[PDB]
């Protein structure tokens, strides 16, 4: 019963930094993107106008992660039954490679869409109590930034929520295109960068302690 705060894939320092500077360059480009500035109203006075690198500038520092299960040390929400899975134990501390299909921004959060492998999905838990009509692991994400009081698993709920729009074809076609991928918009600040090339990152399926 040596359970962590939460299971998940924790990117390397290298890759995590790679995802960061790419995430920040995404924030910068979309901020200066014309069409984004056209829907700047949907995202008192224009003292700062809008600088996205500062809008979610608050970002928990360290290695990024895609949380599978939140344990809280010991069975909090069936966590000890998660850790009892031979798949989880055999995978604990092992190395894995996550695939960042597409980055995204929303008025609440900003993150990355992780498309887990079948082997990586064996870990992902279907327990929690927009997910309707979307395949398993669709919640798989990596929070890259939250604007102040946006304080929960909201980048995963946003990502899934943005994936519901696309489910029905709300993508809205290429609203434009940034470097390293294509751009779309589907609602109030519901912008999405579909990376033309998957940003594959290196991570380890361990758990946090602290």
């Amino acid at each position, epitope marked *: 019963d040596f359970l962590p705060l939460y299971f998940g894939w*924790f990117l390397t*320092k290298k890759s995590s930094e790679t995802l960061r500077k790419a995430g920040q360059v995404f924030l910068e480009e979309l901020g200066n993107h014309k069409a984004f500035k056209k829907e700047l109203r949907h995202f008192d006075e224009p003292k700062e106008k809008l600088e996205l690198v500062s809008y979610f500038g608050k970002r928990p520092p360290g290695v990024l992660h895609c949380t599978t299960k939140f344990c809280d040390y010991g069975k909090a929400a069936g966590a000890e039954e998660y850790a009892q899975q031979e798949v989880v134990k055999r995978s604990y501390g092992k190395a894995f490679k996550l695939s960042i299909s597409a980055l995204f921004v929303t008025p609440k959060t900003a993150g990355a869409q992780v498309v887990l492998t079948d082997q990586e999905l064996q870990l992902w838990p279907s327990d929690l109590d927009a997910s309707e009509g979307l395949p398993p692991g669709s919640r798989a994400h990596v929070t890259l930034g939250c604007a102040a009081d946006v304080q929960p698993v909201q980048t995963g709920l946003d990502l899934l929520d943005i994936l519901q729009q696309v489910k029905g074809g709300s993508q809205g076609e290429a609203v434009g295109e940034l470097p390293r991928g294509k751009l779309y918009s589907l609602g109030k600040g519901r912008w999405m960068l579909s990376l033309t090339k998957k940003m594959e990152v290196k991570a380890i399926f361990t758990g946090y302690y602290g």
Partner: nanobody
Amino acid sequence: EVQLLESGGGSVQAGGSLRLSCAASGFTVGDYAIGWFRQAPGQQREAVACISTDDGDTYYADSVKGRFTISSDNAKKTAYLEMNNLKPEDTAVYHCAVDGWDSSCTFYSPSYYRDFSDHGAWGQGTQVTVSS
């Protein structure tokens, strides 16, 4: 063929000094991090230190700071822990651990766990035993 050739330990007395040397093989230079973990009998392993063959940056447990000093002859692909002021509470079977996945010291941090058998290596044993 990843294999760690650790050595340089043994029995000493309090206040003494040792030098654990780990010649890691089977990894490139700059994409691995080499550091020892000491796991005393009946306690949990703790990262004593590591050194990144890329950054050249080192980590130390607070208890071993200034007393132990890790180093890496990246060319020879070996690392050395310069243990000093060794106390009896530093008795354990020190284990050279190389992280090939992350040249960082990130997973030497006590906040995570890294099975060094996946993309790294685990030293069998260099037994340190301080006395008096």
